[PDB]
Design a protein. Structure first.
Length: 64
DNA sequence: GTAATTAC
DNA sequence: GTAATTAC
């Protein structure tokens, strides 16, 4: 699994792959939802080249 | 503006 | 309804 580093609203974030819920491709970017504790869902996206192999396996296994 | 999808 | 993400 590992982790994913991204930027969201002027803030640089890092998130555990195990906390990622939904993954999808939009053009050439990979967008996703993740669990940020409590009942809250977060959002994020990275460039294809920056996506860990584990995030890419979740995508292909999902693609929804 | 557009893409896919979401949180709020 | 809208703003948020990368790359044209």
């Amino acid at each position: 699994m590992a982790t994913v580093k991204f930027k969201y609203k002027g803030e640089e974030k890092e998130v555990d792959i195990s906390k990622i819920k939904k993954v999808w491709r939009v053009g050439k970017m990979i967008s996703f939802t993740y669990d940020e504790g409590g009942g809250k869902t977060g959002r994020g996206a990275v460039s294809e080249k920056d996506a860990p192999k584990e995030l890419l396996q979740m995508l292909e296994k999902q693609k929804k």
